[PDB]
Design a protein around this ligand. Structure first.
Ligand SMILES: NC(=O)c1cc([N+](=O)[O-])ccc1NCc1cccnc1
Length: 294
């Protein structure tokens, strides 16, 4: 607004437009998101306001929430790059395993924190994982989904990415659990390793069938209750499950084991962020510094 000097259009998020801005006073450089219409539900205001208290080293800090003139502004801590850009930049050589492991470990710490406070992300993707020169990675937009909701796109003709959506969401379950975040992070872990999205669906059904083609069509044995889900259809093709060794090569067995637990179909069997932190995959975790060209 008037207390900030737009420094650049960081982009156009799923809620609204985002700008890099400098606080004319404090001199602080922040990310300002303009939230998309009229009146603005007070329920959301209280919700969003509660998130200002959700502070952790691996969670992008929500500095302020400003409600004015039918517009809602969220002021966030600023980070220079997102994981999607970093992955693209590292596409030729790949992100080194030690850095992939460091990032996964930090993201799990961030999820464990949010989940312990009953806060879900619901829409994790590389674009909302932010990184800095110190080797830190942080989760952005935690709790906004709950505080609000979801239309058809973002806010103005922009295709919602379904690549990281958990199967229970695709099958129409109305109640999401912390498990949806573990699923998304598993998909991201695989993408960092292979340098290709794991399940790049272009429609809700293509997304679901890409998952089924790789992990096998779920049934009552591996996922009790799945055949009673809202959008489950007995007519779904029945695909056999593939071997992880073929899914994320050349990841080692510690990595494949952890990924398999993050991608279990039954949300209740899916590993928690807390439990994942204890997985043998992290026995030799360290905190490397990435090569960032800003
Ligand atoms: N908090 C942020 O710094 C930030 C916020 C959003 N967003 O949608 O609210 C997107 C990217 C961000 N940083 C990474 C970034 C990406 C591109 C150019 N500059 C910075």
């Amino acid at each position: 607004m008037e207390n900030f000097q737009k420094v650049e259009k960081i982009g156009e998020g799923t809620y609204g437009v985002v700008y890099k801005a400098r606080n004319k006073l404090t001199g602080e450089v922040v990310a300002l998101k303009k939230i998309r219409t009229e009146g603005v539900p007070s329920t959301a205001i209280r919700e969003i306001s509660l998130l200002k208290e959700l502070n952790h080293p691996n969670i992008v800090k929500l500095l302020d929430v400003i409600h004015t003139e039918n517009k809602l502004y969220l002021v966030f801590e600023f980070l220079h790059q997102d994981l999607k850009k970093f992955m693209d930049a590292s596409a030729l050589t790949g992100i080194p395993l030690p850095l992939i492991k460091s990032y996964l470990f930090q993201l799990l710490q961030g999820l464990a924190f949010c989940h312990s406070h009953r806060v879900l992300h619901r829409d994790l993707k590389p674009q909302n994982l932010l990184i800095n020169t110190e080797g830190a990675i942080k989760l952005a937009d935690f709790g906004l989904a709950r505080a609000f909701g979801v239309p058809v796109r973002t806010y103005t003709h922009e295709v919602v990415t379904l690549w990281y959506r958990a199967p229970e969401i695709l099958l129409g379950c109305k109640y999401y659990s912390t498990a949806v975040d573990i699923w998304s992070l598993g998909c991201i872990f695989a993408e960092m390793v292979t340098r290709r999205a794991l399940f790049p669906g272009d429609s809700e059904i293509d997304q679901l069938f890409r998952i089924f083609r790789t992990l096998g069509t779920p049934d009552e044995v591996v996922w009790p209750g799945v055949t009673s889900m809202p959008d489950y259809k007995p007519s779904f093709p029945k695909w056999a499950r593939q071997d992880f060794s073929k899914v994320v090569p050349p990841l080692d067995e510690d990595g494949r084991s952890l990924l398999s637990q993050m991608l279990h179909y039954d949300p209740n069997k899916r590993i928690s962020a807390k439990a994942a932190l204890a997985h043998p995959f992290f026995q030799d975790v360290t905190k490397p510094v990435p090569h960032l060209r800003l």
